[PDB]
Design a protein around this nucleic acid. Structure first.
Lengths: 62, 205, 393, 82, 86
RNA sequence: AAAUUGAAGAGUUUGAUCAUGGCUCAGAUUGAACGCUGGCGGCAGGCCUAACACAUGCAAGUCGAACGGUAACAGGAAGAAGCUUGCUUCUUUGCUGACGAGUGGCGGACGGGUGAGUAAUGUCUGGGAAACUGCCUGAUGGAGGGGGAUAACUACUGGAAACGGUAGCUAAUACCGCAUAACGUCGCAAGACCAAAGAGGGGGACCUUCGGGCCUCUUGCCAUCGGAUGUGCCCAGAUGGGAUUAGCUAGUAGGUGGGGUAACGGCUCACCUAGGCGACGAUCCCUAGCUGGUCUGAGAGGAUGACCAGCCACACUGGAACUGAGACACGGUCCAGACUCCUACGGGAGGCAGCAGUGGGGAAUAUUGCACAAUGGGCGCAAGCCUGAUGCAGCCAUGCCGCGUGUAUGAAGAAGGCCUUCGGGUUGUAAAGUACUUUCAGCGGGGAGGAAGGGAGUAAAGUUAAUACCUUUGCUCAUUGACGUUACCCGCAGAAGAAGCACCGGCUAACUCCGUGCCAGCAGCCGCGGUAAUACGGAGGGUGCAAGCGUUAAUCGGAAUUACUGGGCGUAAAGCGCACGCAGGCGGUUUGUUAAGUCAGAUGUGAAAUCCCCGGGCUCAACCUGGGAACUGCAUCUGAUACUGGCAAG
RNA sequence: GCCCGGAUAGCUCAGUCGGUAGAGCAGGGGAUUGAAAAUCCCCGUGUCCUUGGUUCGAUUCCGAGUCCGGGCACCA
């Protein structure tokens, strides 16, 4: 599946073992998923403070 | 869960007093009435057919001081009972102990009265009650605990209930620190803060 | 279901040191073999000199303290560690966990790199309590040249400020003491006499808050996850509630078992190796980078303030100054971890042979408090010794 | 063989029983063919908490049934017709 | 499941199994004595023979040897032959 | 003791507009996860994945008042022995209490778990006729006599273990025939014929081997006819998919006889006739336990059976047979398969989809709990014994609800942030200040009910031997709570210990600014974003929810978007290219006649639990529980005869 | 717990794997444009593995460590 990664900051790799939720984005062909940040080998997203529960991002960081 | 923060914020958005923070600031310095909260409070709020429903639901839950889980609970009970859910819920909303305690002057605000009911300050039928959501029965009496009969905040509140008309299903006596819940609450004096057309719209979604 | 180890007499964590091929496993077998004859009362016996499949299968040396035995004064547990330069890490951490070490050297090779490395650890990171054994003595063609061969060991001691002759240096042939040669069985047991008195005695921090730096971990089929290692502080008993801190998220469990040397344990004690079984824990999650403890006594940290002395070239230190922005390896209990370092206000460098205040920033968290010792290494050499003065967030 | 026994009901620390016509081949809190009463051993000020059908037990024991000991007790404090 | 705290009712089942097996073939093959009275043509002598059979035909179903209400069908199948006579 | 409250719109086609129609969407819910965050209390909930394999523990047995025995323990009884010396050792004695082990009797097949089979006469809904049973229970009879075995025990002995081996003794509620028996059994009738077991308590008299007998009571047995919870059959109607899934059957279709069955039928074997079943779905191959009921929605319809409860099948696999009322079976027996394990290499051992525990799978899951207190179940002659059955604390935000985290008051509102017209405004009475209590948590104090039964003493009654024995009650008091400092309540400071999470372009509640400047990404659709963006990301403020929060998936809704409820077809996707005409459907008009359906009526049923309506209760709620309302139909049968249907004529 | 290998401009290719790392290809910016493509005119990248060491000299060697692959190795 092709799976969207949201916000800038990418800790996932061409062998990063990860979890993915549904991400609806018919804007991009075939993309029906979204990759969960701060789960398995994927770390949380950069420059977030309005999310804590989303992106795996915890009580806020830079 | 209860409001621990600044209480007068709410009244300014909701176009009502909410019967909390009923004090005053001196000479109307930065008095912040007749405005909605924050720097953008002079901007008009914008509606939709569901938006009106969410703003009316916030209103009723700020009137009677109840959670959304409490209001969802009472609305299931309203629908369990025969007749129409709308009027069945309005009967539920008016009878509960925390509201009857504010009506009966024990709390000069809603938050004084909810703290009184939790903190065993009111006993009802002569038996101690530590929950906001106890239904007072007709012709029964709510009665202050001795350790709350000393509370200066309550003693001022019960005087603020004298020469103050009370909803005609109850009376209170400052001198006893006891109030008779004389009869059942009456929709022909007080009703809740929502639209009876909107409450059946969401099942069609 | 298992049988119980009983905490009688004092008890100590020790270990062999020296090179590969020298005797590093032979000596620790051979002492325990003659101990069962001499201390224990037995006659030379075939089951004395060989050991069971079941211990060999797990005590591969490099992950397990495979050896437990008894002497007239104390019980011992003992750790086995690599004798080669391809792998030294489990010695240099094991030094801070042990109360002393058993130094083996072979006349056949002469001294090799790990007989000269492991002797330094008791100054550098651990404790200076070393007892010595000269192996393969029977090989040398002249006895009067064997006597000069032993003056080499007194020099090797004297290189790292160990007293060259007031250290006990037994002469022996450990594989001949092991098998039951009449001359070499009679020239090993002097070493257990010294082991009973050179420590001199263990002392255990069993008053303090429980700290088990985990050495190793096991997966019991049908029962789950046991975490084990030398206890640095405190106590455990069966049914205690326990916290795992360190390189992972902090979580709580119940210690529902307590064991030592594959036996159930009436009480886990400081200064000795102890294992703990854990309720509702799965072998998928746990790692050795963890530290078991009493809930809310110690927390994971990546950052810490510390005092650290930089060695002088005299002590085998640097001769070049130690600049800011270095990436030394630290040594904490069972585990090593690397951090980037910082120097005080207006200090770009500190000279060799001088003390400084430092702030470290590790590349992974470990459980830390004040008063925990380390040594630093910068690659090719150890360069300093220090202590965590407080933790940082 | 048929029995008149307790089958168990009610929440933790606050139990209940339905008195029931059952078989010993059945499960205690499961299969029964009739409820002949109710017994709340703990409840206070609950008038609807307790019944027992004496008329029904008299039919069953005529068909060769046995009353269990809780039932044989409870019929002596319930009225001898129901 | 895997275990029970006792094992002896399982051995009670084998003790019973072998004493039933050893005599279920006994009580049924005596009928070769009955068959000669069926062959002799005469209903009363056929019946007297089946009455000589009745001692072992009721006990074979009382006992474990075939269990249940199995005497009734054996008496029925053997009668359905000898009731052709009169 | 009654009943309904339900049906929707919104973003999106173009320069502008109507209709049609897809797409997206607001709602509700899950044994759900993910990720953040979290204090307190009640009741509830926690594999929804591998029917995949389980370490280790633990889950129905029990009676010495069936029998033979005497390992253990204590005692009595007797002997013997020692300055432990009239106090003390050893021995003997089954002599007694008693019980290790054996024989023996009934349930272990029960409870508990799982959803793998089965699209099924299991199950749902309702009837039909040839059926049966543990054991409880109604009721009738019987108990003659004789013969016979062997383990335990006794001795001897092999192997690593499984496994035992060798030889001897003997008892029963153990073994067996004949006898002997009721409303009994078979037989068309004559007539023949059917069981089996005793044991235990005790007294005046009476025998006596002084064991025992007799006597009488108690307890137990066996046959047999009745009742009953439970269970089986038969029958009717219903039960997902592939028709690009067309043949299936003779052990059939029909019949007849034996065999066989609890009973029943080609069940099965055989004969005889040739029929039966299907393309409006035989057959073939695929999936799936069902159902009360759970979720969703006007409901139809759809999803769905889970938490609780009725029922079925199954328990690592394959073959078979049995114990017993009943089981190719979960807890058991022989063998095989695979794996695994012990092993002296010969041989043997095992299956948590019981309870707790665990590895693994996977997106994901409690303590090798605790307890005799109370409920049921199994043995018990009775006292009693068993039970992870049962009850009940723990863990965890898994479920639902209720409560709290302080509050009355209080400004030149003061700094700051934010916004700004640069005045101030605002965040916010929020802070500072003034006034007050501690609920809850903590700690301390006090403490109900879940408890009934059961034990023993003692008196009377009954049973009875005048008498004990046997037993019930009355009465006395012996004794009984895991959960547990309980439920619930009282004392005591003191705000002390209790707020994070998501959202702000519109649909969608929240607006302004700044930066990154078509970038970061951003929304589900239309789309936003290309240097002063409520669309990004942040700030502040605002909005919304709250110890839970968002988000993702899944189901159902909006949808009438397969339209009975509720659509179009000239042309919106669209009427067969046309005729002729069977299947099946539909049938003018008139005379007579009929009614199962319909309709009127009745009888039988969908019980409980679950559901719904109305009560009651645990302080309230969640939660628990009663009563009352619901079950339109279905099976069968009775009246009317307009009508569908039936029968006959015109 | 440890040990081993891989880290030349976005891409590519060279460079005693000891002797100050060199060049190319493609692309981006600006202008055009409200912006972009394309075009036209200008221009940059080296994580030459991070970081300590060895030496007369580190790009290329040794330890320390990250990501990613691989090795050593266990069941109280």
């Amino acid at each position: 599946v092709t799976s969207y990664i949201g916000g800038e900051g990418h800790n996932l790799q061409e062998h990063s073992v990860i979890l993915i939720r549904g991400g609806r984005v018919k804007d991009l062909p075939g993309v029906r998923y979204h990759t969960v940040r701060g789960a398995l080998d994927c770390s949380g997203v950069k420059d977030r403070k309005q999310a804590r529960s989303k992106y795996g991002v915890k009580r806020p960081k830079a | 869960a209860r409001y621990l923060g600044p209480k007068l914020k709410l009244s300014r958005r909701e176009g009502t007093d909410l019967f909390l923070k009923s004090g005053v600031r001196a000479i109307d310095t930065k008095c912040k009435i007749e405005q909605a909260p924050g720097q953008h409070g002079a901007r008009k709020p914008r509606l939709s057919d569901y938006g009106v429903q969410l703003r009316e639901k916030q209103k009723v839950r700020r009137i009677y001081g109840v959670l959304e889980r409490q209001f969802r609970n009472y609305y299931k009970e309203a629908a369990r009972l025969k007749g129409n859910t709308g009027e069945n819920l309005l009967a539920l909303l008016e009878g509960r102990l925390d509201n009857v305690v504010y009506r009966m002057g024990f709390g000069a605000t809603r938050a004084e009265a909810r703290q009184l009911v939790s903190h065993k300050a009111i006993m009802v039928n002569g038996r101690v009650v530590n929950i906001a959501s106890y239904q007072v029965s007709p012709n029964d009496v709510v009665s202050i605990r001795e350790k709350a009969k000393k509370q200066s905040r309550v003693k001022a509140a019960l005087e603020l209930a004298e020469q103050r008309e009370k909803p005609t299903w109850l009376e209170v006596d400052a001198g006893k620190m006891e109030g008779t819940f004389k009869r059942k609450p009456e929709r022909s004096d007080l009703s809740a803060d929502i639209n009876e057309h909107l409450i059946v719209e969401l099942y069609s979604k | 279901s298992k049988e119980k180890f009983e905490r009688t007499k004092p008890h100590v964590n020790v270990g062999t040191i020296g090179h590969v091929d020298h005797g590093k496993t032979t000596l620790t077998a051979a002492i325990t073999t003659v101990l069962a004859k001499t201390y224990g009362g037995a006659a030379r016996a075939f089951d004395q000199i060989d050991n069971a499949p079941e211990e060999k299968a797990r005590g591969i040396t490099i992950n397990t303290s495979h050896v437990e035995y008894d002497t007239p004064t104390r019980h011992y547990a003992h750790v086995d560690c690599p004798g080669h330069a391809d792998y030294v890490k489990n010695m240099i951490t094991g030094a801070a966990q042990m109360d002393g070490a058993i130094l083996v050297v072979a006349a056949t090779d002469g001294p090799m790199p790990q007989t000269r490395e492991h002797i330094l650890l008791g100054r550098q990171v651990g404790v200076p309590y070393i007892i010595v054994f000269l192996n393969k003595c029977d090989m040398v063609d002249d006895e009067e040249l064997l006597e000069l061969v032993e003056m080499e060991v007194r020099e090797l001691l004297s290189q790292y400020d160990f007293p060259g002759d007031d250290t006990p240096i037994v002469r022996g042939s450990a594989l001949k003491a092991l098998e039951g040669d009449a001359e070499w069985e009679a020239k090993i047991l002097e070493l257990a006499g010294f082991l009973d008195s050179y420590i001199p005695e263990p002392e255990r921090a069993i008053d303090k808050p429980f700290l088990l730096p985990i050495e190793d971990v096991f997966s019991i089929s049908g029962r789950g996850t046991v975490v084990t290692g030398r206890v640095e502080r405190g106590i455990i008993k069966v049914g205690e509630e326990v916290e795992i801190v360190g390189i992972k998220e902090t979580q709580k469990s119940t210690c529902t078992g307590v064991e030592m040397f594959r036996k159930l344990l009436d009480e886990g004690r400081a200064g000795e190796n102890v294992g703990v079984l854990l309720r509702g824990i799965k072998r998928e999650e746990i790692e050795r980078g963890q530290v078991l403890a009493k809930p809310g006594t110690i927390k994971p940290h990546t950052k810490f303030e510390s005092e650290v002395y930089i060695l002088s070239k005299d002590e085998g230190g640097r001769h070049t100054p130690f600049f800011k922005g270095y990436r030394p390896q630290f040594y904490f209990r069972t585990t090593d971890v690397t951090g980037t370092i910082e120097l005080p206000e207006g200090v770009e460098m500190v000279m060799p042979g001088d003390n400084i205040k430092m702030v470290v920033t590790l590349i992974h968290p470990i459980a830390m408090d004040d008063g925990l010792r380390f040594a630093i290494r910068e690659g090719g050499r150890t360069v300093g010794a220090g202590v965590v003065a407080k933790v940082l967030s | 063989m048929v029995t008149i026994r307790l089958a168990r009901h009610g929440a933790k620390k606050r139990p209940f029983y339905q008195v029931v016509v059952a078989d010993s081949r059945n499960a205690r809190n499961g299969r029964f063919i009739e409820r002949v009463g109710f017994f709340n051993p703990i409840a206070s000020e609950k008038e609807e908490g307790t019944r027992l059908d004496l008329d029904r037990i008299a039919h069953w024991v005529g068909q060769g049934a046995t009353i269990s000991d809780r039932v044989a007790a409870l019929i002596k404090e319930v009225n001898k017709a129901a | 499941a895997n275990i029970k705290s006792a094992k002896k009712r399982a051995i009670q089942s084998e003790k019973a199994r072998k004493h039933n097996a050893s005599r279920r073939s006994m009580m049924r093959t005596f009928i070769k004595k009955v068959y000669a009275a069926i062959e002799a043509g005469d209903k009363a002598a056929a019946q007297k023979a089946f009455n000589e059979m009745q001692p072992i035909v009721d006990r074979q179903a009382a006992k474990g040897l075939i269990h249940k209400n199995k005497a009734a069908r054996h008496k029925a199948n053997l009668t359905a032959q000898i009731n052709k006579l009169a």
